[PDB]
Structures are given as C-alpha cells and as structure tokens.
C-alpha cells in the first residue's frame, strides 16, 4: 500500500482537478508521458448529486448516489479508455474514492444525479447500490443533531455525519463489500491506487477490512503481487484526540501540516525564516516520509476549503508559489502530489470568498475541454500549473536526483539558502529583500548547467541562465530580489 507503482523514473503525481477523462488520456499522451509524469490523481469517478443550488459547484462530487462510473467527467466507456492509454504510455492513474458517506441528509429525493439514478436521501434509500436505512449508522451517532458537534471525541468524528453527509455503517461486511466491490471494479480496469476520502472520519480497522477485499493490480501492467497504492486524507494538524498515525497500517497519509508550514515560511510569518527549513520534515514534527504524501496546496484549501487556512500558497499567487513547489520537489521528504487547478471568479466580501463554491469551467453545466495554447499554457480558464516550466522543469528535476542524499546546505541566517542532493542536483533561493550574489559548493561535476527555472536546455544550449560549475565543484550564483522567479535550480540532465 505504500508504494506509488508508478513506472521507475517517476516520481510524481498530479491532480488534474475536475478534468474531464478524454482530456487526461490526451494529457497523458502528448505531455505527462513525455515530460516524466508518474501518475494522475482524479475526481470521484462515481455517480454523485446534481446540485443546482448553487450551479454545480465542486463539493457535490463529494456527494455520492450510485457507484456507476458516470460522471460530468465521462462514462465507464471514457474512463476505462484513459485507463488504457495512460497506463499504456507509463502514467498511473489514482482515484479519489469517497466511501465514508453518501449525499446529504437533506438533499432532495429522486433523479438529480449524473446518471439519472433515483435516490432517497430521507429514507436513506440508494437503491443503484442498493444501501437501505440498515447501511446507515444513524443508530450508532450518539450527538443530539446526528452530526460531528465536537472533534475532540474521536467516537462522533467517526460515527456521526460530516456537516449532515449520510454515513455509511462500514462495520457491517455487506457495505464494505459494496465498496470493495466497487474498488475492485476499477483496480481490475487498471487502476494502481486509490486517495481515501475523508479517511479521519473512518475507523482505522474499518478501512482495513475494506483493503483485506481489494484485488491486486491488473498483472497485463503490473507485476504480479502488486498492492494498490494507498494515501489516506486525514486532516492532523495536532491537538486532535484522532493522529495521522493510527493509519500507518493501512498506507501513506496526507501530511497537511507540510502545505501550511511552508506558507508561513515561505510568507515569512510570525518571523519565520527560509534558514529554518534546514531540519525540514520529520524535524518538524511531520510524519515519517516513507508514510508522506506532500502537497503545498489542495483542491480543498486553495479555495479556503481545507486545513491550512490563510498561509496556504496557490496559484494566485504565482511568484512564491513556483518557489514552494519548488522547494518541496527538491526536498528528499515524502512523493510529491501537484496540483492543477482551474480559475473562478474570488470574490472576497469579508476576508471571506463568496465565490469558492464555482465548478469547472463549463458551458451550461458541461465541462470545458481542456485547450492547448501555441506557448503550451492552458486556455479554457484551466490553470494547468503542472505545464507551467518552472514546476514541470521542477518535476523532472525530482526525477533525476532521486535517491540522491540531502548536501551541501547554505544559508544566510535569514532567507536565501541552497542545497544539493549528492551529485545530481543543486537549488538555491532567494526570498530576502536584496540580492544574492556568492560563490556557493554544488558537489557537483564541473561543466555548464543551464538553470532549469529561467530556460531549457534546448539543442545544446541554454534558453535562460547559464551556470559554471569549477573543478571543485564551487559556482558563483547571482540572484536579484527583483528576478521573476527568485530561485535557480540546477541538475545532472541540464548539463551542457
Ligand atoms: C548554440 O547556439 C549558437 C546560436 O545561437 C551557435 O553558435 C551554436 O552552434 C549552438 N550550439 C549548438 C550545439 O547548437
Ligand atoms: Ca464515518
């Protein structure tokens, strides 16, 4: 469960939020495959809620009705496609799975979902499953609404409903069955892994008896033996009676005290610094990375809809965000996840945006397809940060120093560092208010290197910065505060 399964070379994964499958198995074709991509993390797969109120926004993905593979991202037909062709070109795909409950409680019955499957939710009767009142532990939530009131009792977190999302009772072996029966569905379609849901509102055990009835990957691409790769989304940002811990057992856990450090940092918040990423990971109080799975953001909280809060970076804004991804796919702690988003209108009324509620770019409910500009860039409104070349040159820089040991680390007290990993890859920073210019050791081969971050080593030759590498292994880097991008990032594949 802890190993991605992704192809040897590949070391990362990309959330292609709300893209529709066609577009994934193109993607998966004509860039992720060339580009050194891993793998592909993608939306609930499964039949969820139409909601119309507000217009199809996000969130009611997370809103389960059936199993059937049928959603505004495609049919069974599209999904099992972009299975093949990515899995035919390298690039795993790994689905979010949401089996801790179904839709609301108070969502209206009959045929509002994205397969035109009849449901209940006041009788809790899902009869495209079949679930039924039985499957249900209404009996077993002991607060007096039925929902989570209090965190601080790990019981209620687990039994009673998430903001009144109806939970499922997965002590009783007939629904972990039907959901063993439906992750076993898309493990034998190709799948190697699976994102588990709201996994902190479920019983350890629980998901271990799910994962006991899970197959082991289709042998026409895996190696026979081969577990479904598994990272449990449990939101532990301390202080909760409930670790991130206590999942160990079952696969990798999402480590969000990693995103929202690294803001604070990188924000220079509360007078924190750049030089104290010097114990990075587990001095900090993270995780064990054999057991990390890392993001600087989220589909959740990018939009303020998860842990992290206000010092989480994205997109928005672009300059320090490339230098956090950067730094986090430099870093040797936990696989990295990127995020590829799509933009909404923010509307910030009180500190607060009225508008994080926006789906995918659509024509009256129907997604976008996703469009490729001359430059490479995304039209649409889709961001596509993963083709941006400062993180997709990050990407493979990931690729290329892997397994290479953590060196050669500088810093000048305040926030312009710099660290190798063994002889394969040197990065250095610069987030003060002034400039850097120093001769720093790269432990790296002499030659010269083109910085990875301004340009591409394209035909021989460097598009952007160039940098000279002596015989010891020292270099002279020159970083302006002014520079587009503050950070220069150098490896074994960019030598001249
Ligand atoms: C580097 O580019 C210049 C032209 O811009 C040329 O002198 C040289 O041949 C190029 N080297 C290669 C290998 O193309
Ligand atoms: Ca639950």
């Given at each position: 469960?802890?190993?991605?399964?992704?192809?040897?070379?590949?070391?990362?994964?990309?959330?292609?939020?709300?893209?529709?499958?066609?577009?994934?198995?193109?993607?998966?074709?004509?860039?992720?495959?060339?580009?050194?991509?891993?793998?592909?993390?993608?939306?609930?797969?499964?039949?969820?809620?139409?909601?119309?109120?507000?217009?199809?926004?996000?969130?009611?993905?997370?809103?389960?009705?059936?199993?059937?593979?049928?959603?505004?991202?495609?049919?069974?037909?599209?999904?099992?496609?972009?299975?093949?062709?990515?899995?035919?070109?390298?690039?795993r795909i790994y689905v979010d799975a949401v089996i801790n409950?179904?839709?609301?409680?108070?969502?209206?019955?009959?045929?509002?979902?994205?397969?035109?499957?009849?449901?209940?939710?006041?009788?809790?009767?899902?009869?495209?499953?079949?679930?039924?009142?039985?499957?249900?532990?209404?009996?077993?939530?002991?607060?007096?609404?039925?929902?989570?009131?209090?965190?601080?009792?790990?019981?209620?977190?687990?039994?009673?409903r998430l903001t009144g999302l109806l939970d499922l009772a997965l002590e009783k072996d007939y629904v972990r069955s039907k959901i063993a029966e439906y992750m076993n569905h898309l493990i034998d379609i190709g799948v190697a892994g699976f994102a588990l849901d709201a996994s902190?509102?479920?019983?350890?055990?629980?998901?271990?008896?799910?994962?006991?009835?899970?197959?082991?990957?289709?042998?026409?691409?895996?190696?026979?033996g081969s577990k479904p790769f598994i990272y449990?989304?449990?939101?532990?940002?301390?202080?909760?009676?409930?670790?991130?811990?206590?999942?160990?057992?079952?696969?990798?856990v999402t480590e969000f005290k990693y995103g929202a450090k690294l803001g604070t940092v990188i924000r220079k918040w509360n007078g924190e610094k750049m030089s104290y990423l010097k114990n990075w990971g587990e001095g900090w109080g993270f995780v064990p990375s054999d057991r990390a799975l890392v993001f600087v953001d989220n589909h959740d909280n990018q939009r303020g809809h998860?842990?992290?809060?206000?010092?989480?970076?994205?997109?928005?804004?672009?300059?320090?965000?490339?230098?956090?991804?950067?730094?986090?796919?430099?870093?040797?702690?936990?696989?990295?996840?990127?995020?590829?988003?799509?933009?909404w209108p923010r509307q910030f009324q009180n500190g607060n945006d009225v508008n994080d509620w926006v789906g995918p770019p659509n024509?009256?409910?129907?997604?976008?397809?996703?469009?490729?500009?001359?430059?490479?860039?995304?039209?649409?409104?889709?961001?596509?940060?993963?083709?941006?070349?400062?993180?997709?040159?990050?990407?493979?820089?990931?690729?290329?120093?892997?397994?290479?040991p953590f060196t050669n680390w500088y810093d000048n007290g305040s926030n312009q560092v710099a660290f190798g990993r063994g002889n394969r890859g040197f990065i250095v920073f610069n987030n003060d208010d002034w400039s850097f210019s120093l001769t720093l050791q790269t432990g790296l081969p002499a030659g010269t290197y083109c910085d990875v971050i301004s340009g591409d080593k394209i035909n021989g030759n460097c598009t952007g910065i160039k940098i000279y590498v002596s015989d010891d292994g020292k270099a002279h880097f020159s970083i302006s505060n002014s520079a587009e991008d503050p950070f220069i990032a150098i490896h074994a594949e960019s030598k001249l």
């Amino acid at each position: 469960q802890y190993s991605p399964n992704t192809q040897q070379g590949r070391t990362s994964i990309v959330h292609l939020f709300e893209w529709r499958w066609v577009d994934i198995a193109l993607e998966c074709e004509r860039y992720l495959a060339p580009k050194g991509f891993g793998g592909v993390q993608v939306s609930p797969p499964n039949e969820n809620v139409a909601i119309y109120n507000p217009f199809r926004p996000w969130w009611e993905r997370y809103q389960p009705v059936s199993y059937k593979l049928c959603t505004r991202s495609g049919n069974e037909d599209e999904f099992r496609n972009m299975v093949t062709r990515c899995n035919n070109v390298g690039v795993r795909i790994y689905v979010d799975a949401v089996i801790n409950h179904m839709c609301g409680n108070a969502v209206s019955a009959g045929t509002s979902s994205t397969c035109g499957s009849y449901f209940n939710p006041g009788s809790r009767d899902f009869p495209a499953v079949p679930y039924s009142g039985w499957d249900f532990n209404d009996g077993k939530c002991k607060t007096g609404s039925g929902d989570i009131e209090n965190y601080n009792d790990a019981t209620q977190v687990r039994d009673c409903r998430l903001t009144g999302l109806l939970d499922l009772a997965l002590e009783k072996d007939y629904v972990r069955s039907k959901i063993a029966e439906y992750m076993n569905h898309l493990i034998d379609i190709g799948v190697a892994g699976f994102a588990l849901d709201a996994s902190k509102h479920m019983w350890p055990g629980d998901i271990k008896a799910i994962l006991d009835k899970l197959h082991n990957l289709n042998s026409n691409w895996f190696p026979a033996g081969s577990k479904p790769f598994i990272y449990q989304e449990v939101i532990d940002l301390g202080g909760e009676p409930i670790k991130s811990s206590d999942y160990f057992g079952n696969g990798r856990v999402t480590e969000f005290k990693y995103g929202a450090k690294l803001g604070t940092v990188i924000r220079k918040w509360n007078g924190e610094k750049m030089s104290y990423l010097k114990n990075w990971g587990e001095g900090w109080g993270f995780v064990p990375s054999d057991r990390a799975l890392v993001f600087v953001d989220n589909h959740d909280n990018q939009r303020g809809h998860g842990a992290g809060g206000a010092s989480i970076l994205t997109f928005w804004d672009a300059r320090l965000y490339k230098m956090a991804v950067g730094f986090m796919l430099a870093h040797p702690y936990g696989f990295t996840r990127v995020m590829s988003s799509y933009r909404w209108p923010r509307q910030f009324q009180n500190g607060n945006d009225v508008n994080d509620w926006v789906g995918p770019p659509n024509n009256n409910g129907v997604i976008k397809e996703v469009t490729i500009n001359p430059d490479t860039t995304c039209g649409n409104d889709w961001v596509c940060e993963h083709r941006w070349r400062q993180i997709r040159n990050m990407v493979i820089f990931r690729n290329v120093v892997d397994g290479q040991p953590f060196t050669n680390w500088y810093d000048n007290g305040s926030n312009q560092v710099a660290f190798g990993r063994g002889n394969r890859g040197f990065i250095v920073f610069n987030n003060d208010d002034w400039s850097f210019s120093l001769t720093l050791q790269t432990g790296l081969p002499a030659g010269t290197y083109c910085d990875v971050i301004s340009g591409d080593k394209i035909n021989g030759n460097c598009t952007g910065i160039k940098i000279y590498v002596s015989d010891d292994g020292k270099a002279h880097f020159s970083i302006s505060n002014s520079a587009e991008d503050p950070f220069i990032a150098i490896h074994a594949e960019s030598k001249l």
